[PDB]
Design a binder for this molecule. Sequence first.
Ligand code: DIF
Ligand code: DIF
Ligand code: DIF
Ligand code: PLM
Ligand code: PLM
Ligand code: F15
Ligand code: F15
Length: 581
Amino acid sequence: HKSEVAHRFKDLGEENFKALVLIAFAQYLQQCPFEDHVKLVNEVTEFAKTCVADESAENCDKSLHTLFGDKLCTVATLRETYGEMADCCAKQEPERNECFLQHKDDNPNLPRLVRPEVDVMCTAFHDNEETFLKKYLYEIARRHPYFYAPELLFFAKRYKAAFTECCQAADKAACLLPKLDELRDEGKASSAKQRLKCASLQKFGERAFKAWAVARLSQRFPKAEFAEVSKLVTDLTKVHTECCHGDLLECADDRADLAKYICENQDSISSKLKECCEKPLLEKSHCIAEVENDEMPADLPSLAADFVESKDVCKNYAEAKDVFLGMFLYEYARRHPDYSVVLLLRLAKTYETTLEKCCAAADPHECYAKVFDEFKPLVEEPQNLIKQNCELFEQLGEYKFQNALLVRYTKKVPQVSTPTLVEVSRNLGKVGSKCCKHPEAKRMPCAEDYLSVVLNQLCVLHEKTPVSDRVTKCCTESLVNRRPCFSALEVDETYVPKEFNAETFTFHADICTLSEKERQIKKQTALVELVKHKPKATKEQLKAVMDDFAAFVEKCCKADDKETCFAEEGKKLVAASQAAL
Ligand SMILES: O=C(O)Cc1ccccc1Nc1c(Cl)cccc1Cl
Ligand SMILES: O=C(O)Cc1ccccc1Nc1c(Cl)cccc1Cl
Ligand SMILES: O=C(O)Cc1ccccc1Nc1c(Cl)cccc1Cl
Ligand SMILES: CCCCCCCCCCCCCCCC(=O)O
Ligand SMILES: CCCCCCCCCCCCCCCC(=O)O
Ligand SMILES: CCCCCCCCCCCCCCC(=O)O
Ligand SMILES: CCCCCCCCCCCCCCC(=O)O
């Protein structure tokens, strides 16, 4: 590696190199126009080949940080556009890159990205694929300067496959839109998941993160010896720490190093890694992260012998408490691909609590003997919540399930924005539709994944405009207790019912024209409003009004002279409803 540029160019290949250079420059000069970036990319790229051709040619020996930095400092408009930032150029290297890093503007001031109409997209895509996709890679990149670049490239290649398949299709729109919606929802997720994990590291500390890592790596690689898992957790934590700090190159080298180590040791780690470990460097660690849980060994013994009945337990524990607890977690997790990572941490928390008590008691061995009994109810808490919620989803399909949740949650915290109540209830519903289609053994992990995202966008909102001490408690307390804290929220018996407002409950024929999606939001918004005005209404009372309203819609949307029927029938609907309630 006499020439870092050349080496990166060789391993990445021109196309990927060029796309990653774009994301990089977009993530730092977030205010320059696309066309600007393209000339930079081409300049770097053209230089790059100089080096591939001959690693000794001038400047090819410079480090990437130095070359990147040099390019930045040749943007003539740097001081005018970016201000302080151009001051970084007066600093010699290690300081320089660090300064630039610091001036990335997370959530800058850019207009919301509009999805054009299907026709427009397919025509732009068809007319000039590359600029069409890289423009939007730029648009997305510049609006998230901390989104892991290679994963942004991974999204863009998938968009590419969406437009390829869909712009040739019969019904273009019906093919594409669910795809774009799927992509958008995922990227939003990934973005918030990155920030979440990093804020968890800072707030709760390495140790906790390492615990989380154990659980996670154990479920995935059940055949791996603990020493091996431990080695991976150690290194993962270091990766996380670097990546959370934000430097693209160092995060990437770190992730690569770990992935190559994993791949050089597949036999000691997991049988399912063969295909990922065949992928080129760009894709390896990404692939490994997505890999399926390895199948777990057959003759795994109960944890009794090592963690309950073995004398020397306290001795073993006090010797190296964290390692020992690491061991309990390890053993436990790998036997349970079906538990959420968080349920497992609750278990280890618990195991910790008692060993702490019993090892200090008159008779440790007897004291800590019936301890796996405590695990019981913690385990069936998420299980039952799952069984019963999927049971309900199956009864009333997605929409009515949403409406059920809608009532439940509006009652619990009626101080929340109507539209926010509608957003989360619907997302939640969508989590039903996804996870419940799984067998039991795969439902809790699934719910864990999806709830962490929904719950989180939910706390992020609340942090900006808070409205409930109880939600603030849940969002700021333990992330392991985050979900159970919401599940513990109760009806606000304090809430003062909301003022009746007829406009809120006035309806017009335009709803007959809406799409089932818009129509539904219309109805669910009104339902939240209804529950805020009459919070003590009964599930039955509510069902009676809802049926009453629904019918009213099917009569006036199939009525000659729709609008005089909405007002007249609506006046009645409302009076009658006000009286039932
Ligand atoms: O929804 C957004 O604002 C961003 C967006 C646009 C299109 C598709 C997905 C996403 N999510 C997303 C986000 Cl929020 C940031 C970076 C990259 C992606 Cl893919
Ligand atoms: O979920 C995590 O944060 C990481 C995770 C889970 C399961 C398996 C591997 C990994 N992490 C991981 C990653 Cl994200 C990249 C390279 C190597 C490893 Cl071990
Ligand atoms: O141990 C804790 O209380 C924090 C906690 C709660 C729920 C889920 C995970 C974590 N731990 C955690 C930590 Cl401590 C750092 C980075 C990422 C994660 Cl997931
Ligand atoms: C002189 C050019 C300046 C900046 C060049 C950008 C270099 C991009 C490097 C990103 C490599 C991504 C490899 C992924 C490896 C991994 O994540 O495991
Ligand atoms: C702005 C903050 C939004 C808060 C919205 C309140 C909606 C509560 C969502 C709770 C989801 C909890 C998932 C477990 C299911 C349950 O026990 O109810
Ligand atoms: C899955 C049904 C959609 C509605 C959401 C209700 C979820 C209730 C059960 C959540 C269990 C998630 C596991 C996280 C944990 O261990 O606490
Ligand atoms: C205070 C009483 C005002 C009466 C107005 C009635 C509220 C109607 C909102 C109900 C929405 C339920 C939708 C059910 C469905 O989709 O069929």
